[PDB]
Design goal:
The structure is cut from a larger assembly and holds three copies of chain A (about 150 residues), two copies of chain B (about 50 residues) and one copy of chain C (about 40 residues). By secondary structure, chain B is mostly helical. Chain B contains two helices and no strands. Chain C has about 40 residues and is largely without helices or strands. Classes of the chains: A mainly alpha (about 150), B mainly alpha (about 50), C little secondary structure (about 40). Chain C: Homohexamer. Part of the packaging complex composed of RDRP, P4 and P7.
């Protein structure tokens, strides 16, 4: 059963997308593998949460809102839903070799990191040096007045 | 005046009784030297 | 609040069962079996 | 019959590659541990 | 009676549907079995939650929202309401025999499932193999740089 | 993963802004290093909070409340976001620059000061990195001859 808190928002969201264009109705019917009739898929959404999710992946425009709210009230489907919906990210031909050149470089940062502290520190310390000189003067002067 | 409150001392001291066993300072240095042995692997003159 | 996060990501030492099976049964609920009628 | 595979996992359990280990400084390594590595050293299709 | 939290939303929702078209008023009067007058059914809705539900089944357009909210505050009617409102789903003549052919097939999946692990795993493992080759190269290279 | 609670806060915020003006593509690519397309940058937000926080601060019309919401919902990103966003305040001609603006900066110095040593030491260390590379080689060569 789909939880009402979700379903309240979910059902009209889908129905709106259907009324927007018919072209999606055929798509979701293919992905979910349900009868092409708009009344059919809407009967399926209510029945299973897993199904409800795949529909909201097919339409991301208006539907993204409910989907997240579905995800909240159902941590269960979260794992299963993540698997059923997947697309291999196209990899660039240059990428893996292009990464090979930075081997020398990153090992240099991590030598500097360990010395300073956490990476957060080094990002700070780097700015402190890059920082304008006057500021060093400013801080010295406040200490001249007594301020710490 | 300051009131002593027995038994809170005895809860705390019931806790630190095992603590004082395993944190004794004599047991840190036997831990350190054992590291400096595994780590060096090489003549001392070098590495400053 | 104390952070137990780091300690949370762990793996369990794996091992292989001698006779494989009983895998998808991890979570299921069979609803009860009725008794016979009486007379 | 292979001389290394008995060194490499006694380097792991004793912790010490090149030097003697005293009598006090003896740590504890859980059995399932050494198994995890022996898997990489002398791999087999039978866990048994 | 009907809880106010629901009734607040419920009553105007129904009244709106009535004002939209008269054709529904006669329908709900038939289903609920109440006096055809719009004032009558509106008196019935307030009186019983079970009745309130059947009305909201008759009108799903604007009414679906309140219905779910009715369902929340009343888990009691949920069982009873589900029974009173039912329609036999028309079955396709081909279906049951058409399912008979997959007997051979599904038993094949469940042999593969048990081996791998939960069905979720096998869906993953299937993708891992279907996945492009370069990625195997990529991962090997990060291990070459000493990353884990 | 990005918390779903803050997700519904950030996604309409960044999207509305992207559709409001195309010019905001200059911010995403500058810091975050996201891909040129508006669709991919969206996936980066969903992926990482640090990435998301740098999307929220950069687009400032509708964003601030949303950004502060992200902070509390995922508190680990606090130190990271506040730091990775820093803008030098230039200089005040008047003596009283104060903590008005420069507050964040004079704090920043002290951390760097604390680590290195006495305030002098840092300014020294500041310069050592500013010195021409050659001087290093010089010091090394005068070491090579056996002078120290």
């Amino acid at each position: 059963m789909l939880l009402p808190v979700v379903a309240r928002a979910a059902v009209p969201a889908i129905e709106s997308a259907i009324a927007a264009t018919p072209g999606l109705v055929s798509r979701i019917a293919a992905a979910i593998g349900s009868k092409v009739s708009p009344s059919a898929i809407l009967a399926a959404v209510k029945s299973n949460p897993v199904v409800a999710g795949l529909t909201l992946a097919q339409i991301g425009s208006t539907g993204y809102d409910a989907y997240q709210q579905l995800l909240e009230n159902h941590p269960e489907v979260a794992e299963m839903l993540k698997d059923l919906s997947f697309k291999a990210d196209e990899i660039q031909p240059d990428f893996i070799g292009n990464l090979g050149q930075y081997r020398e470089e990153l090992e240099l940062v991590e030598d500097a990191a360990r010395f300073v502290g956490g990476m957060s520190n080094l990002i700070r310390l780097r700015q402190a040096l890059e920082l304008d000189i006057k500021y060093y003067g400013l801080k010295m002067q406040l200490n001249d007045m007594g301020y710490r | 005046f300051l009131d002593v409150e027995p038994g809170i001392s005895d809860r705390m001291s019931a806790t630190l009784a095992p603590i004082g066993n395993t944190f004794a300072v004599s047991a840190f240095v036997k831990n350190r030297t054992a590291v400096y042995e595994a780590v060096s692997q090489r003549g001392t003159v070098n590495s400053n | 609040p104390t952070s137990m996060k780091a300690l949370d990501h762990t793996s369990i030492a794996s091992v292989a069962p001698l006779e494989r099976g009983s895998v998808d049964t991890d979570d299921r609920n069979s609803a009860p079996r009725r008794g016979a009628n009486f007379s | 019959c292979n001389p290394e595979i008995w060194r490499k996992l006694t380097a792991y359990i004793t912790g010490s590659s090149n030097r003697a280990i005293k009598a006090d400084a003896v740590g504890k390594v859980p059995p399932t541990a050494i198994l995890e590595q022996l898997r990489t050293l002398a791999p087999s299709e039978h866990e048994l």
